[PDB]
């Protein structure tokens, strides 16, 4: 039974090491969510600091890949940072070679191709992570593209990742069934973040303080993360209506 | 060789003469110097003709693959970056001097490129042995906010200056117009101001004039059946 | 480390056999039968395609018979993809020889080269062998018409008549019975088709299940012609020999 | 580090089977159905866009891919394996042909190059076979229209019409009854849509079906005018609306 | 080329002419010699146009990758990356680069990297063929902690003289101002600076 | 193979009874252009060694970084890095001499002439020279470039042989060095008025003097 | 089963058992700690005196990287030395290209990526150490702890080895009782106490205390070992607290 | 058990069995003792013969004028490691005109041994070493294990029955550390130490091997009638 140890086919045509890498993805017990506005793309993720000895400012699963592209990761931090460093290197090289900023969907494809190689080559293991890339692309507009350990990737109107992804997914599905549009019809990113947090609260059934969340926002020509005090202002507005 | 590039209202135009030489001898009287890198990115080449042709096709090939990989139409800045890095690596030994022009989702663009790898931006440019004659015309008649018709006129007038005044240039004017939101229109032999006059005499020989030693049928067909 | 997952493809058994070679030969025994017969005035190559469909485009299809150069052809039995790798290598070797000596490569020299490549995969590299057996039909001005076979071990031998693939035991007995030294191509064509007709696992032998080829000096004067038969031409020769 | 897996991971078993290739074919069998039909004046290839989530934008996932202006490809099996094979196939069409002969390869030879890549993943050290079967449709001047299937082993076969994946056995029987040598392209598209409906459970429309043709030259898709010999690509992907128009005449 | 960079109270300003030369022929009369390698780190280029463009593109790549990992780089760090390329490839390069940048901690800084690949931190720097003619003028007229308007005048007057005497220099005078307030581009035409 | 671009001129030095003195001006020339006026060409290593460098400035800055790295490396896993296992002048010189000879042997030299001045653990004076060719030598007085032709003759009048070293005080030695720097300013066209001077003494340690100037000059007699 | 016989193999849980077994070697090692103070960091380690024949103060465990970073580790000592050697190469190349000394967060990732790389292949073994490291850069003090998996975070206080539970509890008290912060000299005293308190898990043999620190005010942002009078003062403070 | 097939595999309790098996080869080896004062450092080694016709296997190897070691375990592995030490001592002298510190020599040996414990295909070294030397900080004694662990000591012993000599040195610690400026008495203490590890056999003239290094004493090895004085 060595077909379960390396990435070769089982008699059912399955790759067990890939399947087990998907399971490692939920080891952090963290849920993330991404949505698109008119002018922006918002990504939120749960933040859990279980040890009082930790410096909470260094605990993060959101990464600034380039000026325009942000990435949230679902999975262990070592594999997350491995993927982050590579994505940063790939984005920088792309700009040098081809003279323009690497698009979000193209970076997703590139990282997905790298992941595919780990499923075919025996000496390399898959990374136990799911990567959600976000940006406001200069051609395609607000963009969400998500990669997994199988080497699969696709664009999203909105998406969710983590142990409780299904609850969040169904909640988002129901909203877009009502509105009948592919995005949040809102002018400011502040209100799109408020939408994202509200619908995560509804889906998970839990309340959040300023230290329980982590937020990333993509606008035209920059991606940035919010501070605890920026998130607090967001939480206050949600409670006041 | 005379090649020019001119920006206008809603796009860019490039033009070139059609003479290729080997020292003082004219090898081809109707040469095609306007090359296609991609459907809406065209370039004209001066210098070593094989190098301009080869470097254009290599980058054009890689641009096509890049376009397929990214699901996006190719950009002029990509062609420029790939061309300059390739040429810099070979330290001028690849003798390609190019004017690169085109339209893409970002807009309309005009650049020039020198064999060592240096690039330039401009509203009007000229390259080749007839570049000084062409640039004289461009510096005399260029203005901001040219129309399509004015730019074609200016570009071909600049090539004509090279044709008539530079011995390295001659014959016809080729033009390619790249306008935003339109197909690029390649105008081969846009002007033909150098048709040879009828000769004074016919030099068709009587049949049997040439002395022959042997005749034989050459078998170009494959080995036959039966 | 990695040793754990190594099958060790190039080792002897306690009996002194090469495991992977033996198992590759087992694979080849399930492939469609290919037959080669050598006559005084030419060579015949006949081969059976494996259980086909009515929607298969036969006239553009090739799985059995391949041209190596103008004088040499091969019949394949085994993994088609493996065979095409070796076939391309053989085509290159023939051209290398032609460039070097300005003469067409003698048949045996080409056969030895391909057979040596097969041998290498059984002695070093830790890779699986090629699951292919070839019948080589060819002509040169030293030995004239020649038939050879090679198998995954890299061993090769010469033949007057030979079969590879499925039911070779039955096929070889039938060939040994009816073959004679003074035989001609037209007689050899009939023997090859009759042998396939009796050994086939199909209900009947039809044109759409066959590939056929002849190498004849039936080319206008001292030269050799290769003829890869078309579907209609296989249909005609089946009627002529009285099988359909 | 270093790749220390320099030995084959696909080997012959006592019965003569190459296990990893058989298992790859099993993965293809589980894959979503795709098909191809050849007409007198064209070829059609089609498949279902099985969307993993309704929040996913399935237009961003292309199952039918342009390889050259006159050659297209579709698959059944593992999507990621297909995606990298399309990248390699596009590149090899240039490196081993267009950069040599100044023209795009004929369908049969590009198929041959893709097959070679798939064969090597079956013998080279430290790799598994590709878990896909490909259907490649194309046109070239001297061979006309053609359709090829490529399997994990690297074997390839030319077809008049065929199907691969989930419901291939039933689909091939359906195609045998309908196919003749006098079909026009529109007839082949009609038959393709009829055949594909049988293997689809849920929604059946232009948004859930991906369909492309190899047909007439499209000068409107060339992107430039002025060269008479350049007349445009023969590969064209049908739009959502174009599919729905032909579903009313179904 | 006539190029210079000058630190002042609020930051630093880079200045340059716009002439590119192949012999006596002006191959480009409206060249942009002030090049951006990071948001508030720019450089002035002199020497081979191919070499200095290649170097600047590589530095921009290095600082873009630095920023993604470690945040905004210092001007000293940018100068070091320039130096590494110029020093290690001294046999094959003809490049004279002035690096200028604005930090909030360090404020305006200027580094000059001559042919050999050495680095020199200075209050102001001049380079290019035209600089030879203004060593006297610049040394007599430079003061530390000048205002924005004074520094613009100093550069305008300096490059005016460099253009007047150096045939290789000419066209328009461009400047780029680097402060806490942001990045401002300036341009001055012949009819303005020739009458100074 | 290259050519020096930005260059530094003479470095001069001598031994005295309790230690060594070394000096060099603060100029970086660009051919005949006196381009850079604030260049430090004496580089201290710890509190017992000063390395003086002439020739190519880009290569000097490279050597400066090598010495900085040498101090970092010596401190690694070394509890006695500031005591018995500190860097000696002799260690620093031998390392540089190795690098210089290796670089000339690859036909890619560091275009410099270097003088390492210092005091050893046992109090012994250290003074040795190395250049772009890997050539090395020691003497009671050492000087590079123009200094070799003009400074050495003056410094050798103070310490002519080994036995003159114990008879030479630090005041007499510094006086001689300062006078030599004045003479070089009179006569070397690639020299400057501003210079640095370093004294390494076995009792009082390392004294580094910056922003020194050539003074008490005679020109008056030029009016005739 | 068999999933734990080879590195880089995912178990059906999604776990790398070989990495988890490396943690067991870390837990078997001596206690080492790190404390983040107002303008710097303090490192301390327990050194077991196996025999009288060990020369006191000679077998130094804490290691310096560059001139501003300190590193201490518990587990297989040679593995820790190998990691520090790599760290020294990483810091040297950073300073070579970028001039400035490597920032602590930057240095943390360099070690992290290297340790993570030893979980990607079966041809290598994971590191059998957890490393506590940090120092002062342009943005102030930073303290990190890095595990065999490659995982690392920033810390206010950190502990690893056989007496890590005891040490952690002591560190948590300091965080609660000093929200404003701890001075460098206080942190040295507290570090001595915590190692002495954590020595109860290793009470069979007696030990030797080793402390180091980097502080902006006390050491000019350079890494230095605590020696002589300041070390004795910390030992006295520690001995007073256990009695 | 299932985790001792190679050096690249941890056991479930975090042990490296191949390294532990390499450690076992040292325990089978013949006893050797190391001890030092403030002026000198001494190695004493019991050499082992194959039979009465055979020679006695040499145990002590000189690395430089100021440094050398004694071995216990696989002798060819000691030759590889001592050759490496000779090269490193030599590199230090040629490049830096500097005698290699004994502590730094220990660090280099640790790192060389470590690489063979973390990679596939290789194996750990199967030998233990006792390194003595005199450098700028005086006399030194080091103990090397092929796990990579190197330790600085006043005295120690490795090999079969080494525990008897190690206990003796632990008692005598305060006495032998004070034997300054008297080489003969320091060797006497070492010969008396190694005697606590003998059974059935005693120290003969071709059995005993002694080495010494000190303040004004280059590393020298004594064998044959040169050690009869100490028998
Ligand atoms: Cl890729
Ligand atoms: Mg793998
Ligand atoms: Mg001028």
Curated annotation (Swiss-Prot), chain B:
Give the UniProt subcellular location, in the record's own words: Cytoplasm; Nucleus
Signal peptide range equals none
Q: What cellular component GO annotations does this protein have?
A: cytosol; nucleus; proteasome complex; proteasome core complex, beta-subunit complex; proteasome storage granule
Q: Where is the active site?
A: 1
User: Does the record bear Hydrolase in its keywords?
Assistant: yes
EC annotation from Swiss-Prot or TrEMBL: 3.4.25.1
Pfam families in alphabetical order: Pr_beta_C, Proteasome
Enzyme class, first EC level, given as a word: hydrolase
The protein's UniProt keywords, in alphabetical order, are: Cytoplasm, Hydrolase, Nucleus, Protease, Proteasome, Threonine protease, Zymogen
Q: Which domain of life is it from?
A: Eukaryota
SUPFAM superfamilies to which the protein is assigned, alphabetical: N-terminal nucleophile aminohydrolases (Ntn hydrolases)
GO MF terms, alphabetically ordered: endopeptidase activity; threonine-type endopeptidase activity
Q: Please give a single GO biological process term from the UniProt record.
A: proteasomal ubiquitin-independent protein catabolic process
List the catalysed reactions: Cleavage of peptide bonds with very broad specificity
Give the matching PANTHER family.
METALLOPROTEASE TLDD, PROTEASOME SUBUNIT BETA TYPE-7
Per the entry, what this protein does is: The proteasome degrades poly-ubiquitinated proteins in the cytoplasm and in the nucleus. It is essential for the regulated turnover of proteins and for the removal of misfolded proteins. The proteasome is a multicatalytic proteinase complex that is characterized by its ability to cleave peptides with Arg, Phe, Tyr, Leu, and Glu adjacent to the leaving group at neutral or slightly basic pH. It has an ATP-dependent proteolytic activity.
Supply any other comment: The side chain of Thr-1 acts as a nucleophile, and the N-terminal amino group acts as a proton acceptor. Present with 11400 molecules/cell in log phase SD medium.
Q: Which family does it belong to?
A: Belongs to the peptidase T1B family.
Protein name, UniProt field? Proteasome subunit beta type-2
From Swiss-Prot, chain D:
Keywords on this record? Cytoplasm, Isopeptide bond, Nucleus, Proteasome, Ubl conjugation
Q: Where is this cross-link: Glycyl lysine isopeptide (Lys-Gly) (interchain with G-Cter in ubiquitin)?
A: 108
Pfam families, per this entry?
Proteasome, Proteasome_A_N
Any one Gene Ontology cellular component term annotated for this protein = proteasome storage granule
Localization (cell): Cytoplasm; Nucleus
The protein's predominant localisation is: cytoplasm
Q: What is this protein called?
A: Proteasome subunit alpha type-2
From Swiss-Prot, chain E:
Please give the catalytic activity noted in the UniProt record: Cleavage of peptide bonds with very broad specificity
| GO cellular component assignments | cytosol; nucleus; proteasome complex; proteasome core complex, beta-subunit complex; proteasome storage granule
What PROSITE patterns does the entry give? PROTEASOME_BETA_1 (PS00854), PROTEASOME_BETA_2 (PS51476)
One matching Pfam family: Proteasome
Extract the Gene3D superfamilies matched here.
Glutamine Phosphoribosylpyrophosphate, subunit 1, domain 1 (3.60.20.10)
Name its cellular compartments.
Cytoplasm; Nucleus
Acyltransferase listed as a keyword: no
Q: Where in the sequence is the active site?
A: 1
Q: Which GO terms describe its biological process?
A: proteasomal ubiquitin-independent protein catabolic process; proteasome-mediated ubiquitin-dependent protein catabolic process
**What does this gene product do?**
The proteasome degrades poly-ubiquitinated proteins in the cytoplasm and in the nucleus. It is essential for the regulated turnover of proteins and for the removal of misfolded proteins. The proteasome is a multicatalytic proteinase complex that is characterized by its ability to cleave peptides with Arg, Phe, Tyr, Leu, and Glu adjacent to the leaving group at neutral or slightly basic pH. It has an ATP-dependent proteolytic activity. PRE3 and PRE4 are necessary for the peptidyl-glutamyl-peptide-hydrolyzing activity. This subunit is necessary for the peptidylglutamyl-peptide hydrolyzing activity.
Q: What else is known?
A: The side chain of Thr-1 acts as a nucleophile, and the N-terminal amino group acts as a proton acceptor.
Its protein name is Proteasome subunit beta type-1
Taxonomy of the source species: Eukaryota, Fungi, Dikarya, Ascomycota, Saccharomycotina
Curated annotation (Swiss-Prot), chain F:
Places the protein is found: Cytoplasm; Nucleus
* The entry's keywords: Cytoplasm, Nucleus, Proteasome
Major place of residence: cytoplasm
Cellular component terms, GO, for this chain's entry?
A: cytosol; nucleus; proteasome complex; proteasome core complex, beta-subunit complex; proteasome storage granule
The GO annotation for biological process reads: proteasomal ubiquitin-independent protein catabolic process; proteasome assembly; proteasome-mediated ubiquitin-dependent protein catabolic process
Top-level taxon: Eukaryota
Miscellaneous information on this protein: Present with 16900 molecules/cell in log phase SD medium.
Q: Give the protein's biological function.
A: Non-catalytic component of the proteasome which degrades poly-ubiquitinated proteins in the cytoplasm and in the nucleus. It is essential for the regulated turnover of proteins and for the removal of misfolded proteins. The proteasome is a multicatalytic proteinase complex that is characterized by its ability to cleave peptides with Arg, Phe, Tyr, Leu, and Glu adjacent to the leaving group at neutral or slightly basic pH. It has an ATP-dependent proteolytic activity. PRE3 and PRE4 are necessary for the peptidyl-glutamyl-peptide-hydrolyzing activity.
Family from the record: Belongs to the peptidase T1B family.
Q: What is the protein's given name?
A: Proteasome subunit beta type-7
Q: Which gene encodes it?
A: PRE4
Q: Which residues of the full protein are shown?
A: 34 to 257 of 266
């Amino acid at each position: 039974g060595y077909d379960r140890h390396i990435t070769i086919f089982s008699p059912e045509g399955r790759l067990y090491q890939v399947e087990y890498a998907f399971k490692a993805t939920n080891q952090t017990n963290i849920n993330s969510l991404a949505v698109r506005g008119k002018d922006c793309t918002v990504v939120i993720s749960q933040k859990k600091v279980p040890d009082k000895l930790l410096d909470p400012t260094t605990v993060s699963y959101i990464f600034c890949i380039s000026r325009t592209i942000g990435m949230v990761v679902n999975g262990p931090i070592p594999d997350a940072r491995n993927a982050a460093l590579r994505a940063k290197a790939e984005a920088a090289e792309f700009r040098y070679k081809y003279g323009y900023d690497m698009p979000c969907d193209v970076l997703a494809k590139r990282m997905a191709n790298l992941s595919q190689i780990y499923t075919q080559r025996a000496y390399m293991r898959p990374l136990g992570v799911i990567l959600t890339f976000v940006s406001v692309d200069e051609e395609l507009g607000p963009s969400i593209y998500k990669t997994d350990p199988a080497g699969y990737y696709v664009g999203y109107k909105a998406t969710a990742t983590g142990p409780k992804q299904q609850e969040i997914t169904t909640n988002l599905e129901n909203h877009f069934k009502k509105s009948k549009i592919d995005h949040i019809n809102e002018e400011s990113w502040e209100k799109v973040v408020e939408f994202a947090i509200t619908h995560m609260i509804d889906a998970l059934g839990t309340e959040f303080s300023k230290n329980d969340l982590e937020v990333g926002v993509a606008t035209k020509d920059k991606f940035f993360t919010l501070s605890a005090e920026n998130i607090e202002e967001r939480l206050v507005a949600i409670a006041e209506q | 060789t005379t090649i020019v590039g001119v920006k206008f209202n809603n796009g860019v135009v490039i033009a070139a003469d059609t003479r290729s030489t080997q020292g003082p001898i004219v090898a081809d009287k109707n040469c095609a110097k306007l090359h296609r890198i991609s459907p809406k990115i065209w370039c004209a080449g001066a210098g070593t003709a094989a190098d301009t042709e080869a470097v254009t096709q290599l980058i054009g090939s890689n641009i096509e693959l890049h376009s397929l990989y990214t699901s996006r139409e190719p950009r002029v800045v990509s062609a420029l970056q790939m061309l300059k890095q390739h040429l810099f690596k070979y330290q001028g030994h690849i003798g390609a001097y190019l004017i690169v022009a085109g339209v893409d989702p970002t807009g309309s663009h005009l650049f020039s490129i020198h064999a060592h790898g240096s690039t330039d931006v401009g509203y009007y440019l000229s390259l080749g042995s007839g570049s000084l004659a062409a640039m004289a015309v461009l510096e005399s008649h260029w203005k901001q906010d040219l129309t399509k018709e004015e730019a074609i006129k200016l570009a071909s007038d600049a090539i004509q200056a090279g044709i008539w005044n530079d011995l390295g240039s001659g014959s016809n004017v080729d033009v390619c117009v790249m306008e935003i939101g339109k197909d690029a229109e390649y105008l081969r032999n846009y002007l033909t101001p150098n048709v040879r006059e009828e000769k004074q005499k016919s030099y068709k020989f009587p049949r049997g004039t040439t002395a022959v030693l042997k005749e034989s049928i050459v078998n170009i067909c494959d080995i036959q059946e039966e | 480390g990695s040793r754990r997952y190594d099958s060790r493809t190039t080792i002897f058994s306690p009996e002194g056999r090469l495991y992977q070679v033996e198992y590759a030969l087992e694979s080849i025994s399930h492939a469609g039968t290919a037959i080669g017969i050598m006559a005084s005035d030419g060579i015949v190559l006949a081969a059976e395609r494996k259980v086909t469909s009515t929607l298969l485009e036969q006239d553009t299809s090739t799985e059995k018979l391949y041209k190596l150069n103008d004088k040499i052809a091969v019949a394949v039995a085994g993994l088609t993809a493996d065979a095409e790798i070796l076939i391309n290598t053989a085509r290159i070797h023939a051209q290398n020889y032609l460039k070097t000596y300005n003469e067409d490569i003698p048949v045996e020299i080409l056969v030895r080269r391909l057979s040596d490549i097969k041998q290498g995969y059984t002695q070093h590299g830790g890779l699986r062998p090629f699951g292919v057996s070839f019948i080589y039909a060819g002509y040169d001005d030293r030995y004239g018409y020649q038939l050879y076979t090679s198998n995954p071990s890299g061993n090769y031998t010469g033949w007057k008549a030979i079969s590879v693939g499925a039911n070779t035991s039955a096929a070889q007995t039938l060939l040994q019975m009816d073959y004679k030294d003074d035989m001609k191509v037209d007689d050899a064509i009939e023997l090859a088709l009759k042998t396939l007709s009796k050994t086939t696992d199909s209900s009947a032998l039809t044109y759409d299940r066959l590939e056929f080829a002849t190498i004849r000096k039936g080319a206008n004067d001292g030269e050799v012609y290769q003829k890869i038969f078309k579907p209609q031409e296989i249909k005609d020769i089946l009627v002529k020999t009285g099988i359909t | 580090m270093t790749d220390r897996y320099s030995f084959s991971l696909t080997t012959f078993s006592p019965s003569g089977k190459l296990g990893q290739i058989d298992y790859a074919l099993t993965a293809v069998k589980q894959g979503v159905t795709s098909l191809g039909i050849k007409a007198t004046n064209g070829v059609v290839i089609a498949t279902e866009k099985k969307s993993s989530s309704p929040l996913a934008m399935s237009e961003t996932l292309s199952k039918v891919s342009l390889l050259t202006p006159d050659i297209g490809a579709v698959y059944s099996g593992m999507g990621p394996d297909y995606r990298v094979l399309v990248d390699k196939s596009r590149k090899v069409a240039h490196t081993s042909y267009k950069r040599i002969y100044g023209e795009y390869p004929p369908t049969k030879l590009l198929v041959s190059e893709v097959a070679k890549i798939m064969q090597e993943a079956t013998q080279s050290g430290g790799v598994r076979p590709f878990g896909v079967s490909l259907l490649i449709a194309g046109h070239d001047e001297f061979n006309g229209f053609s359709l090829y299937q490529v399997d994990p082993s690297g074997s390839y076969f030319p077809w008049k019409a065929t199907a691969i994946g989930k419901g291939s056995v039933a689909a091939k029987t359906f195609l045998e009854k309908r196919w003749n040598d006098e079909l026009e392209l529109e007839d082949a598209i009609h038959i393709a849509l009829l055949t594909l409906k049988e293997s689809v459970e849920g929604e059946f429309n232009g948004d859930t079906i991906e369909l492309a043709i190899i047909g007439d030259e499209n000068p409107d898709l060339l992107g430039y005018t002025g060269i008479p010999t350049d007349k445009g690509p023969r590969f064209r992907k049908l739009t959502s609306q174009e599919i729905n128009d032909r579903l009313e005449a179904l | 080329t006539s190029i210079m960079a000058v630190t002042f109270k609020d930051g630093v300003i880079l200045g340059a002419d716009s002439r590119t030369t192949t012999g006596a022929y002006i191959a480009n009369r409206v060249t942009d010699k002030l090049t951006r390698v990071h948001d508030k780190i720019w450089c002035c280029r002199s020497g081979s146009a191919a070499d200095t463009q290649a170097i600047a593109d590589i530095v921009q790549y290095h600082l873009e990758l630095y920023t993604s990992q470690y945040g905004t780089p210092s001007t000293e760090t940018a100068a070091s990356v320039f130096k590494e390329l110029c020093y290690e490839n001294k046999d094959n390069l003809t490049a004279g680069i002035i690096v200028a940048g604005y930090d909030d901690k360090n404020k305006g800084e200027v580094y000059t990297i001559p042919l050999g690949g050495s680095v020199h931190k200075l209050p102001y720097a001049i380079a290019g063929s035209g600089s030879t003619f203004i060593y006297g003028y610049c040394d007599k007229n430079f003061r530390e902690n000048m205002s924005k308007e004074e520094t613009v005048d100093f550069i305008k007057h300096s490059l005016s003289q460099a253009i007047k005497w150096d045939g290789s220099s000419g066209g328009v005078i461009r400047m780029v101002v680097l402060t806490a307030a942001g990045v401002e581009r300036l341009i001055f035409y012949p009819d303005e600076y020739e009458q100074l | 193979t290259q050519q020096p671009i930005v260059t530094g001129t003479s470095v001069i030095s001598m031994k005295y009874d309790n230690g060594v003195i070394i000096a060099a001006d603060n100029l970086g020339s660009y051919g005949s252009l006196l381009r850079f006026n604030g260049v430090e060409r004496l580089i201290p290593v710890g509190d017992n060694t000063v390395v003086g460098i002439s020739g190519d400035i880009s290569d000097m800055q490279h050597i400066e970084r090598l010495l900085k790295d040498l101090v970092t490396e010596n401190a690694y896993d070394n509890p006695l890095a500031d005591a018995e296992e500190a860097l000696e002048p002799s260690y620093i010189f031998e390392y540089l001499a190795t690098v210089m000879y290796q670089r000339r042997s690859k036909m890619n030299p560091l275009w410099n002439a270097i003088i390492v001045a210092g005091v050893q653990s046992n109090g012994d004076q250290f003074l040795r020279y190395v250049n772009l060719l890997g050539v090395t030598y020691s003497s009671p007085t050492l000087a590079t470039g123009f200094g070799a032709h003009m400074a050495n003759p003056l410094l050798r009048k103070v310490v002519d042989r080994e036995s003159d070293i114990p008879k030479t005080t630090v005041q007499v030695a510094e006086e001689a060095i300062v006078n030599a720097m004045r003479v070089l300013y009179y006569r070397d066209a690639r020299s400057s008025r501003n210079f640095s001077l370093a004294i390494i003494d076995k009792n009082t340690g390392l004294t580094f003097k910056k922003n020194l100037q050539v003074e008490n000059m005679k020109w008056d007699f030029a009016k005739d | 089963t068999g999933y734990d016989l080879s590195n880089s193999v995912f178990s059906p849980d999604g776990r790398n058992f070989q990495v988890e077994y490396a943690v067991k070697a870390v837990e078997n090692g001596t206690t080492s700690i790190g404390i983040k103070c107002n303008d710097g960091v303090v490192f301390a380690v327990e050194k077991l005196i196996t025999s009288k024949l060990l020369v006191p103060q000679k077998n130094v465990k804490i290691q310096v990287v560059d001139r501003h970073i300190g590193c201490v580790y518990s587990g297989l000592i040679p593995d820790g030395r190998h990691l520090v050697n790599r760290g020294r190469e990483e810091a040297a190349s950073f300073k070579k290209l970028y001039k400035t000394p490597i920032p602590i967060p930057a240095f943390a990732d360099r070690l992290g990526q290297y340790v993570q790389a030893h979980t990607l292949y079966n041809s290598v073994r994971p590191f059998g150490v957890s490393t506590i490291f940090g120092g002062v850069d342009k943005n102030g003090a930073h303290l990190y702890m890095l595990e065999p998996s490659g995982s690392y975070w920033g810390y206010k206080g950190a502990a690893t080895g056989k007496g890590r539970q005891s040490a952690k509890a002591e560190l948590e008290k300091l965080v609660d009782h000093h929200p404003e912060g701890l001075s460098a000299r206080e942190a040295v005293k507290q570090a001595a106490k915590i190692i002495y308190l954590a020595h109860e898990d290793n009470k069979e043999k007696d030990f030797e205390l080793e402390i180091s620190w980097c502080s902006l005010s006390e050491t000019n942002g350079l890494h230095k070992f605590v020696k002589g009078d300041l070390l004795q003062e910390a030992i006295d403070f520690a001995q007073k607290e256990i009695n | 058990n299932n985790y001792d097939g190679d050096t690249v595999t941890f056991s479930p309790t975090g042990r490296l069995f191949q390294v532990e098996y390499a450690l076992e080869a040292i325990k089978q080896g013949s006893v050797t003792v190391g001890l030092r004062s403030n002026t000198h450092a001494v190695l004493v080694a019991l050499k082992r013969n194959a039979d009465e016709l055979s020679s006695y296997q040499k145990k002590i190897i000189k690395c430089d004028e100021h440094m050398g070691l004694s071995l216990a375990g696989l002798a060819p592995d000691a030759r590889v490691l001592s050759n490496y030490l000779r090269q490193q001592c030599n590199y230090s002298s040629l490049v830096f005109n500097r005698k290699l510190a004994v502590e730094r020599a220990g660090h280099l040996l640790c790192d060389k041994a470590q690489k063979n414990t973390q990679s596939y295909g290789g194996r750990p070294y199967g030998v233990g070493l006792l390194i003595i030397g005199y450098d700028k900080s005086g006399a030194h004694l080091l103990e090397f294990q092929p796990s990579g662990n190197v330790t600085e000591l006043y005295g120690t012993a490795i090999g079969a029955r080494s525990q008897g000599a190690k206990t003796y040195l632990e008692r005598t610690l305060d006495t032998f550390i004070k034997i300054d400026g008297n080489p003969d008495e320091l060797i006497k203490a070492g010969v008396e130490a190694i005697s606590q590890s003998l059974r059935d056999e005693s120290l003969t003239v071709d059995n005993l091997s002694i080495a010494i290094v000190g303040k004004d004493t280059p590393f020298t090895i004594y064998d044959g009638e040169a050690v009869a004085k100490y028998i």
